[PDB]
Amino acid sequence: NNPAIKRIGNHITKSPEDKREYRGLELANGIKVLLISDPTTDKSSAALDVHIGSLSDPPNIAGLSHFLEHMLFLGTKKYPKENEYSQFLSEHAGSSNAFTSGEHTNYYFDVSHEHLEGALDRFAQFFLSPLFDESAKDREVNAVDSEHEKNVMNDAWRLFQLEKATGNPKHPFSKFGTGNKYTLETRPNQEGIDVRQELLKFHSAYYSSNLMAVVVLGRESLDDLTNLVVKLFSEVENKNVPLPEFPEHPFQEEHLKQLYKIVPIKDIRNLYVTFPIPDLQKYYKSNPGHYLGHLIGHEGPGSLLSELKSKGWVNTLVGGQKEGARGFMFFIINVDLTEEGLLHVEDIILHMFQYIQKLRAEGPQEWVFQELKDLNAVAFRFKDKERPRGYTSKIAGILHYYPLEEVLTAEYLLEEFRPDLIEMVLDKLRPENVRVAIVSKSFEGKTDRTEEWYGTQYKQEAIPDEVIKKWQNADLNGKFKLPTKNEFIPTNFEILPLEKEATPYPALIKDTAMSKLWFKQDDKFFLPKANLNFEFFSPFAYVDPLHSNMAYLYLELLKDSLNEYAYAAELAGLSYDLQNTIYGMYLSVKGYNDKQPILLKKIIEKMATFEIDEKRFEIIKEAYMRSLNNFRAEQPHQHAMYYLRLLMTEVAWTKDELKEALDDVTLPRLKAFIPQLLSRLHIEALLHGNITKQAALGIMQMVEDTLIEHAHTKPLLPSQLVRYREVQLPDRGWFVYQQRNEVHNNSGIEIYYQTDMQSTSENMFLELFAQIISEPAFNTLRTKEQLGYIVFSGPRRANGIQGLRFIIQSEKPPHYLESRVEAFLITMEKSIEDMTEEAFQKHIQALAIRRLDKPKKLSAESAKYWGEIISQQYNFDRDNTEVAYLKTLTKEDIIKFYKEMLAVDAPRRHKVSVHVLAREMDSNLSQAPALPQPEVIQNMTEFKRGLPLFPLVKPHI
Amino acid sequence: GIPMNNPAIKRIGNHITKSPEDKREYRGLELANGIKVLLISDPTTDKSSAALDVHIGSLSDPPNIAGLSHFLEHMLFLGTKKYPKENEYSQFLSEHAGSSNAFTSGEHTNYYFDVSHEHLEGALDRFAQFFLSPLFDESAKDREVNAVDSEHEKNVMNDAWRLFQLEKATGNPKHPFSKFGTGNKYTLETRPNQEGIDVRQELLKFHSAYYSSNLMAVVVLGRESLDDLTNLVVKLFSEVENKNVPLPEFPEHPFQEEHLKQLYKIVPIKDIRNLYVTFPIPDLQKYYKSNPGHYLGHLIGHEGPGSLLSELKSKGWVNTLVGGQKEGARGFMFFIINVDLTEEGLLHVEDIILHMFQYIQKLRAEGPQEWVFQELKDLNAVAFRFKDKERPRGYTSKIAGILHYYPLEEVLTAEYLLEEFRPDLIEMVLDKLRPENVRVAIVSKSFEGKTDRTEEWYGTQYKQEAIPDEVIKKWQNADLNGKFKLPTKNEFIPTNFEILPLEKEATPYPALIKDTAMSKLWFKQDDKFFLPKANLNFEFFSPFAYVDPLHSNMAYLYLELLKDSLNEYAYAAELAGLSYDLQNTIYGMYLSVKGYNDKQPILLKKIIEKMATFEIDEKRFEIIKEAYMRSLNNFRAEQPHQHAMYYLRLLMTEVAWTKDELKEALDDVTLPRLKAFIPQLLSRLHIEALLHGNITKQAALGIMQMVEDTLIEHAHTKPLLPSQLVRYREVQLPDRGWFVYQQRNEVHNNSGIEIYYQTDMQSTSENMFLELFAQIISEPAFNTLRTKEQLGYIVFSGPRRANGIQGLRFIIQSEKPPHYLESRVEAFLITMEKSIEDMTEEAFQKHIQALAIRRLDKPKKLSAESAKYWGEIISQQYNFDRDNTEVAYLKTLTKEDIIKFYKEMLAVDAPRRHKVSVHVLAREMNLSQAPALPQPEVIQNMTEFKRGLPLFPLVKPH
Ligand SMILES: O=C(C[C@@H](Cc1ccc2ccccc2c1)n1cc([C@@H]2COCCN2C(=O)c2ccc(F)c(F)c2)nn1)NO
Numbered sequence A: 001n002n003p004a005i006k007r008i009g010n011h012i013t014k015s016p017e018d019k020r021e022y023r024g025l026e027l028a029n030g031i032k033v034l035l036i037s038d039p040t041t042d043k044s045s046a047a048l049d050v051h052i053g054s055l056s057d058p059p060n061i062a063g064l065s066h067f068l069e070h071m072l073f074l075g076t077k078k079y080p081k082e083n084e085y086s087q088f089l090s091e092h093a094g095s096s097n098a099f100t101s102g103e104h105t106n107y108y109f110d111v112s113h114e115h116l117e118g119a120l121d122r123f124a125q126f127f128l129s130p131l132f133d134e135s136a137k138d139r140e141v142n143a144v145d146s147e148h149e150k151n152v153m154n155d156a157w158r159l160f161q162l163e164k165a166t167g168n169p170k171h172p173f174s175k176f177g178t179g180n181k182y183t184l185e186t187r188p189n190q191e192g193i194d195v196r197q198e199l200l201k202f203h204s205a206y207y208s209s210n211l212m213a214v215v216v217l218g219r220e221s222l223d224d225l226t227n228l229v230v231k232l233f234s235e236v237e238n239k240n241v242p243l244p245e246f247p248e249h250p251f252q253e254e255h256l257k258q259l260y261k262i263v264p265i266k267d268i269r270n271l272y273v274t275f276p277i278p279d280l281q282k283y284y285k286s287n288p289g290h291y292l293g294h295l296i297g298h299e300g301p302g303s304l305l306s307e308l309k310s311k312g313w314v315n316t317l318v319g320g321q322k323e324g325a326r327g328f329m330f331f332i333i334n335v336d337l338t339e340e341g342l343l344h345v346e347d348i349i350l351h352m353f354q355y356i357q358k359l360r361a362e363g364p365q366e367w368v369f370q371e372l373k374d375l376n377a378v379a380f381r382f383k384d385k386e387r388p389r390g391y392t393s394k395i396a397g398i399l400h401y402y403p404l405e406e407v408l409t410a411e412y413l414l415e416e417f418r419p420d421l422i423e424m425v426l427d428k429l430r431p432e433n434v435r436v437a438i439v440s441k442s443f444e445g446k447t448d449r450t451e452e453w454y455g456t457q458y459k460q461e462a463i464p465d466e467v468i469k470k471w472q473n474a475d476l477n478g479k480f481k482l483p484t485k486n487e488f489i490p491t492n493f494e495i496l497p498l499e500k501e502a503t504p505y506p507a508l509i510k511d512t513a514m515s516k517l518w519f520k521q522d523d524k525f526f527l528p529k530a531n532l533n534f535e536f537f538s539p540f541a542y543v544d545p546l547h548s549n550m551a552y553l554y555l556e557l558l559k560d561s562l563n564e565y566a567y568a569a570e571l572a573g574l575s576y577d578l579q580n581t582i583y584g585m586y587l588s589v590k591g592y593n594d595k596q597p598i599l600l601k602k603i604i605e606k607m608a609t610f611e612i613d614e615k616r617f618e619i620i621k622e623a624y625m626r627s628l629n630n631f632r633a634e635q636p637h638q639h640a641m642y643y644l645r646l647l648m649t650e651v652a653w654t655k656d657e658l659k660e661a662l663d664d665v666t667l668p669r670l671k672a673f674i675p676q677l678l679s680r681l682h683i684e685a686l687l688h689g690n691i692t693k694q695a696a697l698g699i700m701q702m703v704e705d706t707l708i709e710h711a712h713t714k715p716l717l718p719s720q721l722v723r724y725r726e727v728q729l730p731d732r733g734w735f736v737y738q739q740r741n742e743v744h745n746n747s748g749i750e751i752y753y754q755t756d757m758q759s760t761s762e763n764m765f766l767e768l769f770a771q772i773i774s775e776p777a778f779n780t781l782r783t784k785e786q787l788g789y790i791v792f793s794g795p796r797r798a799n800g801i802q803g804l805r806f807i808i809q810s811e812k813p814p815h816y817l818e819s820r821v822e823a824f825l826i827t828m829e830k831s832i833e834d835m836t837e838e839a840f841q842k843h844i845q846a847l848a849i850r851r852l853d854k855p856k857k858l859s860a861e862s863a864k865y866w867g868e869i870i871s872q873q874y875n876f877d878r879d880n881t882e883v884a885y886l887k888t889l890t891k892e893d894i895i896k897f898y899k900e901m902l903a904v905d906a907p908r909r910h911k912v913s914v915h916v917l918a919r920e921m922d923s924n925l926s927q928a929p930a931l932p933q934p935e936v937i938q939n940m941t942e943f944k945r946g947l948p949l950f951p952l953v954k955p956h957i
Numbered sequence B: 001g002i003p004m005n006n007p008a009i010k011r012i013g014n015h016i017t018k019s020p021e022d023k024r025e026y027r028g029l030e031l032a033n034g035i036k037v038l039l040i041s042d043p044t045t046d047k048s049s050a051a052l053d054v055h056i057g058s059l060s061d062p063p064n065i066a067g068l069s070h071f072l073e074h075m076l077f078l079g080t081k082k083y084p085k086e087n088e089y090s091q092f093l094s095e096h097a098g099s100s101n102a103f104t105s106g107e108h109t110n111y112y113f114d115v116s117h118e119h120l121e122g123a124l125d126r127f128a129q130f131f132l133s134p135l136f137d138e139s140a141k142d143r144e145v146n147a148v149d150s151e152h153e154k155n156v157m158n159d160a161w162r163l164f165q166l167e168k169a170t171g172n173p174k175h176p177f178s179k180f181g182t183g184n185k186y187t188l189e190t191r192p193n194q195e196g197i198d199v200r201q202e203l204l205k206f207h208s209a210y211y212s213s214n215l216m217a218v219v220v221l222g223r224e225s226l227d228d229l230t231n232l233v234v235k236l237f238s239e240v241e242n243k244n245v246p247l248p249e250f251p252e253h254p255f256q257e258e259h260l261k262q263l264y265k266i267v268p269i270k271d272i273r274n275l276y277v278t279f280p281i282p283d284l285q286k287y288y289k290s291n292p293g294h295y296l297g298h299l300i301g302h303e304g305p306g307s308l309l310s311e312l313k314s315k316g317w318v319n320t321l322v323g324g325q326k327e328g329a330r331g332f333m334f335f336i337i338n339v340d341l342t343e344e345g346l347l348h349v350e351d352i353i354l355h356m357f358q359y360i361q362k363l364r365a366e367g368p369q370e371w372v373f374q375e376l377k378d379l380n381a382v383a384f385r386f387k388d389k390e391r392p393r394g395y396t397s398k399i400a401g402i403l404h405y406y407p408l409e410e411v412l413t414a415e416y417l418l419e420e421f422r423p424d425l426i427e428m429v430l431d432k433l434r435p436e437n438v439r440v441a442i443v444s445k446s447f448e449g450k451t452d453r454t455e456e457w458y459g460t461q462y463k464q465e466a467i468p469d470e471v472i473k474k475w476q477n478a479d480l481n482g483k484f485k486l487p488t489k490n491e492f493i494p495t496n497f498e499i500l501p502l503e504k505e506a507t508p509y510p511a512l513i514k515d516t517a518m519s520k521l522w523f524k525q526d527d528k529f530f531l532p533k534a535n536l537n538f539e540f541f542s543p544f545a546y547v548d549p550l551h552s553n554m555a556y557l558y559l560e561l562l563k564d565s566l567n568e569y570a571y572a573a574e575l576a577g578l579s580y581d582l583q584n585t586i587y588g589m590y591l592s593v594k595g596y597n598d599k600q601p602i603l604l605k606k607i608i609e610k611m612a613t614f615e616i617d618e619k620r621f622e623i624i625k626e627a628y629m630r631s632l633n634n635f636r637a638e639q640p641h642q643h644a645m646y647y648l649r650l651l652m653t654e655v656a657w658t659k660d661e662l663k664e665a666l667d668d669v670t671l672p673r674l675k676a677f678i679p680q681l682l683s684r685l686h687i688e689a690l691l692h693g694n695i696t697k698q699a700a701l702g703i704m705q706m707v708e709d710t711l712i713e714h715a716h717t718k719p720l721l722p723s724q725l726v727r728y729r730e731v732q733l734p735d736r737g738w739f740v741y742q743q744r745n746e747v748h749n750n751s752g753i754e755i756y757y758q759t760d761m762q763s764t765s766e767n768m769f770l771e772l773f774a775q776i777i778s779e780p781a782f783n784t785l786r787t788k789e790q791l792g793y794i795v796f797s798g799p800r801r802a803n804g805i806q807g808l809r810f811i812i813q814s815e816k817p818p819h820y821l822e823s824r825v826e827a828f829l830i831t832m833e834k835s836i837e838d839m840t841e842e843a844f845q846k847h848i849q850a851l852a853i854r855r856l857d858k859p860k861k862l863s864a865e866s867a868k869y870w871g872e873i874i875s876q877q878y879n880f881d882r883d884n885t886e887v888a889y890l891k892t893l894t895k896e897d898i899i900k901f902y903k904e905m906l907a908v909d910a911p912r913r914h915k916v917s918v919h920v921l922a923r924e925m926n927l928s929q930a931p932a933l934p935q936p937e938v939i940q941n942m943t944e945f946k947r948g949l950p951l952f953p954l955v956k957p958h
């Protein structure tokens, strides 16, 4: 019909509950396309996936493909304004991102549904005519270097790269993929390579239309969308690039039966078991690797984890197939270690091979596979509706692996047991194909090797043949037994009819001294799911560091207890979250509205009648100790945000305070704590989903009755239900707090301009200003001045107060970062006042679109309401009224607000700054303003005592 | 050569015997007109003082005009012939750092003041005219009768006043003892109008009949020499006329035979259970050198091992006992044994009384004990040798009364020193304590409904019965009871009075000699008083003493139970001049130990050990918890203005549990729960202590460590983190805001009001603005709101301080409704604006000097110096030089400064006016111009009120 379209796909199989419309098609230049018509979406979205990545970097230029990824954002022949893409999105309620994996570079964006074409055009140019400006190239090499830096001291990256460096050095799998200033600038300048030539050369060589897939979602009809995609993308040139293949596995036989001992930054104890296996991607219909992962990584009774845990050796286990690349994959079993586990790695692994041996003895189990098939099938039928941005990027990635008519289902459905493949894979899980790595600080000083890129300290030795042989003779262990039929599988998918007095927003359907119960029957999504949210308030949860530690340990121990029972439910789409908070306990139950009452009652009963297992208590406590210490190894901007949260809140226990109180938690004391915690409570709950008002009251009643019967719960007094306030800073004050990060050699800074108490006017002043400065902020402080990879501006909301905040992680000292943010603000004063009235209104509309974007799945709407409820404001219609006020704000309103609240000279300026100094650190351009002397906070307690405390917000109703 | 006799002086006494530690100089003498005079010269005193006690009181009321003595007492303040401005006397004192008071007992009317030492004579001259030329202005008399009515109304629903007059009403109705002494509007106006009495003549008649110089004792204390004090007193008081009035006597007891062997059943206002046993006895006053009454009071009322109380408490029948002689009047006394009653006790009154008579029998069996007398003598002797130095106002008032009862040379010692062992007198008094002489009274709500009589002045509901002769006979036949042993030698009697020498490194103010996670020790070796005494103060912080109502209740009961079990052990120390206080706070616990330093470390160790290792007796636990339940409930019967202040503290503090919340929580306090709470509270602590007195730095550090070591060994205490040491903040009120909180008092038929004008955090600046303003208005506010408008008896102005914040407050209890009182206070503030503007610069500087004198009045005794520091310490301001600093700054203020302050913070149209009012309604609820007031925001809920406002900072330490 049309010459630009090679073929047009037929029905793209979808879920019957999926109301979006789909058309597949393949362009003449080979670009695989999927088109999603959703006339309701408030944001439209496109994504493109190029099937090339880090594995295809030049050997002399580590990280080229990643770098190119960054550079495409900085201008094209048709749109050469460096920040034109990001600025257009920001002015039209959009955003975008991209990532570079081993075989993919993936770019995506969303934007106000009324601006798809303008965004998509600019987006298309990335793949037609990028500038690769020399100036922009020399700047953005720093963002890559800063990105690598944040990862250098991160234990997950260090290991990630160290695996690669213990395989065959000649294999692309060993490449350093992120790149840094050395590999992208310094070594190429020393070696005479022109970097810009190489970006152009790579782009022209590999960004070919035959290796691309594109997904576009908008309100427009599938037809209009077909015309729009052909317009912009058939232009792409096809250079018929062959899809790279890695048939040879990176681990050959000299890399097997090897043992690696590794010393990470954090105090952690891990055991990693790896088996090389053939590439299983083709078998995807059956999925042998997933069947095996399901059993090995089972956490229920008779499981491998179960026994390793009751032997006191392991707490968590992960098992299944791990991606490698077209040509090779891995099977892994990864456990963390107790102190005992670390002494018993030989036996832990023996136990591993014992469970594999039982899976060999029983042979494949068709009922197991069939159970997975029918659950996945139900999962797919009732899948929540995705957000555009992630949906397009996801699908754009898999289009390369499946035909058009099955791209939506290929990754949820399964087709036949195919026990031959299961046996084939299982045959690779043998002692002679094993690689073993142990991570413990106990190897400190006992290593002899250094990994080039990250510096990781490790040792390599061969597994003694005697030990391989013992593992080969693994007997059957009577403690291991296959799973039982999942008893939590849901069976009643009936959607209850809307009650005649249903409400659009949650209604307060119960209000005793015990309970406040908020209820809404789902009237948007009509899936057989419910969300049950409970806030258990008790003053004894946070009264002091000792009690705060005991709340944590109680819930951790409780969940550890429930794990075996609740794993099945989690597999059958029924999950729960149990969390301690500064006001008490948070419990969430989400999933199929069928079996929920079984799980909920089991949890409340186990809470109220818990019996602590002393060995579990010792093991989890020790873990918690290490947890607290390991915060030292977090990142500087993390540390910064933490200190700021400590400074600005009435009450807050530090890690050191908690860590000192921990030694005083004893099993008796914990046992006494729990009934005391439970003795008096107030329960605030949101119940939202496929449930009637009667059902909601009965769930609430069951919770109350179980607590009253088993723990004798009495209500709290109204006067005891107090929330913490935020420190009220003085007009024209500027406080600075200084700490050192002893692990990372970058610094961090958070800067907080506290404005005033939340209210419709103050909320929208702040939100509008943040919107107007959002893109400029990123462009000026990252893109132009390249302060660091992490640069963030936005609102801060805490305890009913709010303000503006800047967060930055950099190698520059924080006081420099201060002047640069101050300089930026001034230049923003000029920019807002030079800003046209038409631009101003573009920003108003962008914010409105964001605020009024409607929630696409039950959980999202639920969390919107929970935010209103826990925050004690209860303004469920907030978006309408606040957007309405928004639309009436003038550019002068915003200028008055800035000069009153934010400007260096503002009369009501309220500035506090946290500075985190790097490890080795010390205690033209637009001109920075002159800054007052900061009052230096030496003691958080003294700081807080000398200031007032804000009020608390008044509820709405 | 014989002397040149001054004729105004009938005689000059010999050496007035005094404590060898007492540096004041004394002279006694009797005027020609028979006034007995003691002169006290004290060249260091910052305030001087005088008092006059007339030996006439309300037993001599005219029979048809109840309360005339008392009323006359009020009227003498309101103007004399030489000083006829109604409030000259009050005004003069106020402007010269002075105050005065007076009171009317059955046989005495006692008047006293205390002002700046430079203005003795001026004060004394205005004072003297009271006894020469009262005006008894007819308008004044019509107004002041309201004050007396409001005083009586204050007392009407008070169980102690009800009982006091009920006793008078159950004796011989024709005896003066049965008179009603307060008076009220009926007996002092209404009835005298119906009966055609001219009250102003009756006043003049009484004053002239009885204010005779021969019934008068005066005491004057001043910086002036003894000779100059003599000339002065002769000058001002010689002209008081001697009508040679005979001193009234009452030789017939008010309780005759038909008033004995009686039982009375009385209904209280509060929920209380008391037993009152009374025996009539002869007038023992004349035997003061042996004190047979107090010997028997000492034994019968003893609280140590083997005691009467001891057994009654083990039976679980009583919790407290009081026994000894009770004053009556010249010619009769009583001997009492009073106990409170448990629930069981109320059912075993007959056995309680039998046990009382068994102990009395043990005393008859053993007979008088010279060694006991010996103990009494020795303790009293030591007490007098090392008597603290008194505030002059109280001292002149006390001595002026007792000049009537003792030779001049003995006024100081008569009440302390024992000289004569009189076993005959002991046996005499003991023979009067017999069932055929006994009167028994029971006070319990359980008689509610079952009474048939009504006491006429208070309304008391009671029934009267004759004690069955079979009961009297069982008490007569009280055989001995082996649980009752006499006390043993008091091993807490101090013997080491040595005053350690003043260390080289010693400091004028307390020094921080220890600062650890556990403890912060303040110390000062005494450098002023040099008595063998010390004060040891400890604040224990725990977040678990006030975390919620339940825990608060448990902190209370813990310390109540603890004090209960230490009582027998600690009683001997109490008698030996060594006492302790233990009481829960909103931050944890407070412990004070005061007295002769000798044996303190023993008592303190016993207290701390018993805290850390406490074993709760289930039976004491039940009894004390029940009493505590009653105590909460009984709050409903406090005065209206007390409620107003209570509610204000509730409203203006961050955290604060109401009586109702405490009471609801009490039922979940179980013995096991309390046993759990104990160690939890003691597990983490911070101790801040002031140790001040006759102790060295080493001994002090040892004391502190001993308290730490004990808590550590037995309760495994660890330190709290600094971040946990949080104090509570005050609610910060909004500019131009005005909130009202309204409540009703369901017992009293008056209303109460507190009005709080918040100003700002305490600083030198703000403190002195408020204090000077409050000084300027102090006297005028009393004179306008009470003396002129007669809003009530209780009228108060002054600073309020709480949680580092401050402001101005008025408190009034009145029959009129709160909103009326608001307008009249507001009216008053306006008049004070004009008054300050019209005040001369000298009159202003005069108010400044008055406040200065008051702020720099140097403490006279160790306890008062200690208290001054302790306030600096628990307020965490640590500003030990505050008086010198703040007075310095005071002296530079100008009347413009104060008018600016008033217009900014206080005036009705002030931009930073922060007004909260508490209105307490009564059970049943021209003049200057009141401004019109904004509509007030009515607080309907304290939690929401507090949630919606900011909280102030805390004051910066020094
Ligand atoms: O490193 C990566 C991720 C890398 C990709 C990248 C690289 C270079 C860019 C240059 C200019 C604009 C966007 C560029 C984006 N990346 C994402 C972000 C975040 C997080 O997600 C959304 C964007 N974003 C922002 O911060 C942000 C916020 C507000 C703005 F107005 C704005 F323009 C950007 N930062 N860097 N892949 O390999």
Ligand SMILES: O=C(C[C@@H](Cc1ccc2ccccc2c1)n1cc([C@@H]2COCCN2C(=O)c2ccc(F)c(F)c2)nn1)NO
Binding pocket: B070, B073, B074, B075, B077, B078, B090, B091, B094, B099, B100, B101, B102, B103, B104, B151, B778, B779, B780, B782, B783, B787, B795
């Ligand atoms: O009732 C009684 C006691 C009665 C004696 C009395 C009687 C009538 C008076 C008339 C005018 C002035 C003082 C009169 C005093 N009394 C004492 C007080 C309190 C507490 O002691 C100090 C005075 N005082 C004040 O409140 C007060 C406060 C500030 C002032 F500037 C001021 F002049 C007075 N109130 N009534 N005896 O039988």
Ligand SMILES: [Zn+2]
Binding pocket: A066, A070, A144, A147
């Ligand atoms: Zn990147």
Ligand SMILES: [Zn+2]
Binding pocket: B070, B074, B148, B151
């Ligand atoms: Zn009076």
